[PDB]
Amino acid sequence: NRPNRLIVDEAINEDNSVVSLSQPKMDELQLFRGDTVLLKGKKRREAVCIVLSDDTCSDEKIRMNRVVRNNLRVRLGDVISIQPCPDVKYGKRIHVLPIDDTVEGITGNLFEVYLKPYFLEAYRPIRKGDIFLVRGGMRAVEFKVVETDPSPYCIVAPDTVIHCEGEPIKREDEEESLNEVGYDDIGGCRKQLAQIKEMVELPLRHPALFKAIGVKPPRGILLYGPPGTGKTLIARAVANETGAFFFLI
Amino acid sequence: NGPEIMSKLAGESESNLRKAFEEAEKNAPAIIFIDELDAIAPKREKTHGEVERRIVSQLLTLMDGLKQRAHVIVMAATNRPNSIDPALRRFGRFDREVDIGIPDATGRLEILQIHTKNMKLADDVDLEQVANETHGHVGADLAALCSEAALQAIRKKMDLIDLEDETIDAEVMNSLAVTMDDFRWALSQSNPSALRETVVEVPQVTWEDIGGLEDVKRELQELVQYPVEHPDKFLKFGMTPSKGVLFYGPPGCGKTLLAKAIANECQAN
Ligand SMILES: Nc1ncnc2c1ncn2[C@@H]1O[C@H](COP(=O)(O)OP(=O)(O)OP(=O)(O)O)[C@@H](O)[C@H]1O
């Protein structure tokens, strides 16, 4: 029922900095053309950037650059909460450095060979965590967050200073994406999983709600059984899916 | 080495374990081998000293750290799998346990041939006969047997030939030969067999070693080979193959040989 709760679907503009529109929806929003719209999804990672390079497709499904699925999302069928937040500050500039596929070949400055021809009159309305493709060549290389002089995201400008002293890395970021075990990874304990869910849903998903009442919560759980029955896996999946901070003692 | 690990101070032992694991991780792909793991890691109810339990936990944490981020394979040696902590054999830590076991007659023959590769031995050694005779000797036991035979040959030659003639040279030492009598003496007088538990080997008794009982031979051949030689036929029908048979009758009819021959026919221990 939430108006800005709408699916996201295929995208065709290979540049991630573009975010779609839906004129019937734009009338609902105040979506203005400029730097940024805050399109909010899962895990707090967003794809914030210039807007309105769409309305080619049908409505009820926002076109968002597929590269903002691995980030900000997982798969199709998801939903975006698009709400404008244009006119960001203009700090120094946003980091410039590649991550994986640039050490393979001539490196030079890692900015003025392949990436420079893209921060042109669209000076990176971004949000740290927006990952995309940008090159001056084979057209498949990532652009990741490394540094942060301004905490909030900004719109870069020339005359600034950048240091590509940083080195491209491994997929620490790709491994980070591959984590957070879930209930789909639990089998053979469906009744036990449901019991754990009904035990830990109220204390974790509703902390203030339970703080309002004066009932005693279940604060001790004894998962006992043969070794290798997924006890730590069950605990990790429950903590990750419910959002509770998991400490592996 | 377990003694090498817990020979030093508790903190020093843990530091040595951590340094070894870090070096193995740095040298990936690397193999970590822990002989006498029961010394480091005894049964949890049996490890009396708190230092020993702390060392066990440090090893567990180090191997878990290898599991999460490393490329090192950890190997361990112990007398019995149950002598070590059951937490060691937990999934993810020690998933697969390999039973080294004892060498059979062919295995003892192979070990003797390996130890006699660089040993000038005569033609009367008949290592097949030695291996067939050798029982209760495992690996290093056969190594000590070969060493004893060589030492007896040397004490027979050097101690009796070159006394006052002239200083020893290469000609006399390379002329040394090991005979069958040296191996016999090593077998008889100067070898303690460290094996006393159950034997796990393919018995040398075959069907020809048994007389008669042709119907029993055929029935046993069915009941054993057919489940293992034709699993598809058993799976096709709705019958689970039998996993046991009982031999009953007057003593002396060869039930033991029947079991040995059916094990040999399937080449089964
Ligand atoms: N019930 C299960 N369903 C799916 N995967 C499982 C299950 N139990 C264990 N696993 C898998 O076993 C592997 C190793 O187990 P893990 O490290 O998670 O410990 P654990 O099984 O919880 O141990 P323990 O029972 O000793 O607490 C993991 O890849 C995990 O996904």
- Rounded to whole angstroms, how far apart are CA atoms A72 and A129? 8
Instruction: Report which secondary-structure segment, H or E, holds A192.
Output: helix A190-200
The C-alpha of B65 sits at a distance from chain A's nearest C-alpha, in angstroms, of 13
Structure tokens at A193: 């999983």
Query: A238 alpha carbon to ligand 1 midpoint, in Å?
Result: 14
* Contact by Cβ (8 Å): A42, A86: no
Q: Which residues are bridge partners to A51 per DSSP?
A: A19
List b or e across B117-145, with b for residues whose CB sees 16 or more CB atoms inside 10 angstroms: eebebeeebebeebbeebeebbbebbebb
A227 touches chain B (CB under 8 A): yes
- Rounded to whole angstroms, how far apart are CA atoms A122 and A94? 13
Backbone angles phi, psi at B11, to 5 degrees: -60, -40
The C-alpha of A176 sits at a distance from chain B's nearest C-alpha, in angstroms, of 14
List b or e across A45-59, with b for residues whose CB sees 16 or more CB atoms inside 10 angstroms: bbbbbbbbbbeeeee
Instruction: Give residue ranges with CB within 6 A of ligand 1.
Output: A 185-189, 227-233; B 90-92
Which residue matches tokens 């740095």?
B26
- In 3D, which of A9, A39, A48 has the Cα closest to residue A155? A48
- State yes or no: B146 annotated in a binding site: no
Q: What is the DSSP letter of A244?
A: P
Resolution of the experimental structure, in angstroms:
3.3
Q: Kindly report the protein residue whose alpha carbon is nearest to atom 23 of ligand 1.
A: A228
- Rounded to whole angstroms, how far apart are CA atoms B203 and B262? 9
- Rounded to whole angstroms, how far apart are CA atoms A99 and A145? 9
Query: B87 alpha carbon to ligand 1 midpoint, in Å?
Result: 14
- State yes or no: B254 annotated in a binding site: yes
- Rounded to whole angstroms, how far apart are CA atoms A237 and A179? 10
DSSP string, A122-191: S-----TT---B--SSSS--B------SSSS-----TT----TTS----THHHHHHS----GGG--S-HH
Task: Give CB contacts under 8 A, 24+ apart, made by A94-98.
Answer: A94/A124, A94/A126, A94/A128, A94/A153, A94/A154, A94/A156, A95/A145, A95/A146, A95/A147, A95/A148, A95/A162, A96/A162, A96/A164, A97/A144, A97/A146, A97/A147, A97/A164, A97/A166, A97/A168, A98/A141, A98/A142, A98/A143, A98/A144, A98/A168
* Contact by Cβ (8 Å): A48, A153: yes
Structure tokens at A204: 């974790």
- Rounded to whole angstroms, how far apart are CA atoms B84 and A48? 56
Structure tokens at B252: 């002396």
* Vertex B140: Cα angle to B136 and B141 (nearest 5): 35
* Contact by Cβ (8 Å): B2, B47: no
- In 3D, which of B113, B108, B124, B104 has the Cα closest to residue B191? B108
Atom of ligand 1 nearest to the CA of A232: 22
The C-alpha of B46 sits at a distance from chain A's nearest C-alpha, in angstroms, of 20
Structure tokens at B107: 């295995």
* Vertex B118: Cα angle to B113 and B119 (nearest 5): 80
* Integer angstrom CA distances of residue A40 from A17, A181, A245: 15, 23, 22
The torsion region of residue A225 among left (phi > 0), alpha (psi -120 to 50) and beta comes to left
User: With contacts defined as CB-CB under 8 Å, which chain B residues touch A228?
Assistant: 90-92
Query: A125 alpha carbon to ligand 1 midpoint, in Å?
Result: 43
Atom of ligand 1 nearest to the CA of A231: 22
